[PDB]
């Protein structure tokens, strides 16, 4: 509350550390469904159904331009990528499996780097 604060965590490396995680996600062999925005002209249903599209290139641009106020907003966008994937793709499909794989890959890096 006012004049009552927890001891100050060093947040000075967060930006660089999120960039490293994102590089690791970008170079994963199963990243291909997530590298670029879904083409809303060429994929029927996507625009209407997926209210907040997100992909790794868009997270990169947001990260590089100071549009993440803290590491929780970064994680929320990465998770949105995988939540969108699950909404639109059957679990038993190459893309559906890719999303599960990448989500796990991310969540481990997240815990290992910050928790």
UniProtKB/Swiss-Prot annotation:
Highest taxon, organism lineage: Eukaryota
Tissue/organ expression: Expressed at varying levels in several tissues, whereas a smaller transcript was expressed specifically in testis.
Limits of the Bromo domain: 9-113
Location(s) in or outside the cell: Nucleus
Disulphide-bonded residues: none
Family of the protein in this entry: Belongs to the WAL family.
Role, per record: Regulatory subunit of the ATP-dependent BRF-1 and BRF-5 ISWI chromatin remodeling complexes, which form ordered nucleosome arrays on chromatin and facilitate access to DNA during DNA-templated processes such as DNA replication, transcription, and repair. Both complexes regulate the spacing of nucleosomes along the chromatin and have the ability to slide mononucleosomes to the center of a DNA template. The BRF-1 ISWI chromatin remodeling complex has a lower ATP hydrolysis rate than the BRF-5 ISWI chromatin remodeling complex.
Oligomer status and interactors: Component of the BRF-1 ISWI chromatin remodeling complex, at least composed of SMARCA1 and BAZ2B, which regulates the spacing of histone octamers on the DNA template to facilitate access to DNA. Within the BRF-1 ISWI chromatin remodeling complex interacts with SMARCA1; the interaction is direct. Component of the BRF-5 ISWI chromatin remodeling complex, at least composed of SMARCA5/SNF2H and BAZ2B, which regulates the spacing of histone octamers on the DNA template to facilitate access to DNA.
Record protein name field: Bromodomain adjacent to zinc finger domain protein 2B
Species of the source: Homo sapiens (Human)
């Amino acid at each position: 509350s006012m004049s009552v604060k927890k001891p100050k965590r060093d947040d000075s490396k967060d930006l660089a550390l999120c960039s490293m995680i994102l590089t690791e996600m970008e170079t994963h062999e199963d990243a291909w469904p997530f590298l670029l925005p879904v083409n809303l002209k060429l994929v029927p249903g996507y625009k209407k159904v997926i209210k907040k599209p997100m992909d790794f290139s868009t997270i990169r641009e947001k990260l590089s331009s100071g549009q993440y106020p803290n590491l929780e907003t970064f994680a929320l966008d990465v998770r949105l990528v995988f939540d969108n994937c699950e909404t639109f793709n059957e679990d038993d499909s190459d893309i559906g499996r890719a999303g599960h794989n990448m989500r796990k890959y991310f969540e481990k890096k997240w815990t290992d780097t910050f928790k």
